Amino acid sequence: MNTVPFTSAPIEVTIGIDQYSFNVKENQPFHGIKDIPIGHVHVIHFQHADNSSMRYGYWFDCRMGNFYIQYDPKDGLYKMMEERDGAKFENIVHNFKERQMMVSYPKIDEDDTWYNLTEFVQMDKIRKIVRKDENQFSYVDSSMTTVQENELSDPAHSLNYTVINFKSREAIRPGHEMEDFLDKSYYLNTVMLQGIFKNSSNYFGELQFAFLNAMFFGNYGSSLQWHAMIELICSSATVPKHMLDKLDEILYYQIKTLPEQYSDILLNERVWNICLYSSFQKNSLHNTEKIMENKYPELL
């Protein structure tokens, strides 16, 4: 069980760690988060009390280094940093734990939620979507645009999700225009899975990462990507059975975790109605259809 210490908390802020969150008051004696489960990526995220604008945060994996948070009064945010001195770090953590200045990652033992949301998400793939190679952790905020959003403006601060565009030469074989547009199996299986992602695990990892960026930072481009990757599968007549069954599990836990009060903005009515009721896979997503119909029957 690993630890992310905080140097201090000089400004009032709501701090998220994965699907949990807690409020810290201005100059409260808060020195970090302990008991973080090893084996998963994690995200530590922030919303300042005095300016809700720019929810931002850091994706990290405690197996890759010792990370801590320190407020920067010049740039006005909580920054993640790596401590290379292992003995310095162990000594800082132990002192803060002894003084009980840390919140405990509050995982219920029965609860597989975070695993289910990050099953296919790997740090190495996050760091290719979010390019900042001198850090082992990845910064994401509310306003960062995607490579596709920029094509339709700073490239170093972009989310390099895989571009999906149903009306593009990549998606449409010359001479198979009608076939490929109405049945996207070629695009899914040859172009995307065999060609770009290599396997369904990397595809699901990007899908899951896009969802989590939408939920945690209100990143519109991330939501656009999440929906595009669902639609591409649902609009394919030929999908491996194991992918459909896994997709149903992935989406079920995403819909289950979504704050009820942000359904209006996080869920695209067209995509979901198409996917659940018109698409080739309208009958393949039983768990997802059931939770959507009982939780968000308005959208449908």
């Binding site: 009306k167 593009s168 030469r169 449409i172 225009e177 009608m178």
Partner: protein, 237 residues
């Protein structure tokens, strides 16, 4: 974006553009079977592709053999239309290719967009105008070539005959749409108007009769009256 009354003069500027109307591509007669069910029989159709500035009409005849063994023919017809328009563009010299293609039905937008991906600089546009191009098969010489076709065929016409020697393309288009609207609203009466006088004939190389300027004013008035007459008969006014 879409083409409407506000930007109507754009049709007659010097940027090459084509209207595409797919309403006569897939044509059927519905009939009873011996067992008392219903079946369709396809008949030859056509794509109506028109340059409104010059009157050049690219009439691609759709022979019933293209439907043989195919399913979901109303959907296929839109994609076949887009395929044939794309093939026409590719067949034209670069300096004759359109800069815009305006589809008369919004359901042609995605099929044509997808078929024209190789031409990102050609705009594919809808229109808010209700154009009467479905009535093209009320023009006897066009109906005749479509029905006689035994194989796929493209036939080129000028739908304005020689009108542009005497009038502008704005006026020619207005005349054409009035004629077609009349043929669409009451075909029998419209054709009566157009031929009632045997001394005015259709030249071998034309589609419409050889009316003088003064005779066109009379004809045009008679077509407006017909459209108004039918509008009253319809709504009881």
């Amino acid at each position: 974006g879409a083409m409407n009354s506000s930007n109507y003069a754009e049709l007659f500027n010097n940027d090459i553009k084509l209207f595409v109307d797919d309403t006569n591509v897939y044509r059927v007669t519905v009939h009873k079977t011996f067992e008392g069910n219903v079946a369709t029989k396809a008949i030859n159709g056509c794509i109506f592709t028109l340059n409104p500035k010059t009157g050049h009409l690219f009439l691609k005849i759709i022979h019933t053999s293209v439907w043989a063994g195919q399913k979901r023919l109303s959907q296929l017809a839109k994609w076949k239309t887009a395929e044939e328009v794309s093939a026409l563009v590719r067949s034209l010299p670069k300096e004759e290719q359109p800069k815009q293609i305006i589809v008369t039905r919004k359901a042609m937008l995605d099929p044509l967009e997808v078929h024209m991906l190789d031409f990102p600089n050609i705009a594919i546009r809808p229109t808010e105008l209700r154009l009467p191009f479905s009535a093209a098969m009320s023009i006897d010489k066009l109906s005749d070539v479509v029905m006689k076709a035994t194989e796929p065929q493209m036939v080129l016409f000028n739908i304005y005959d020689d009108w542009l020697d005497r009038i502008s393309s704005y006026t020619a288009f207005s005349r054409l749409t009035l004629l077609l609207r009349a043929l669409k609203t009451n075909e029998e009466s419209a054709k009566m108007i157009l031929l009632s006088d045997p001394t005015i004939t259709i030249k071998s190389y034309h589609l419409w009769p050889s009316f003088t300027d003064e005779q066109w004013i009379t004809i045009e008035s008679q077509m407006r009256d017909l459209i108004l007459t039918e509008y009253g008969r319809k709504y009881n006014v």
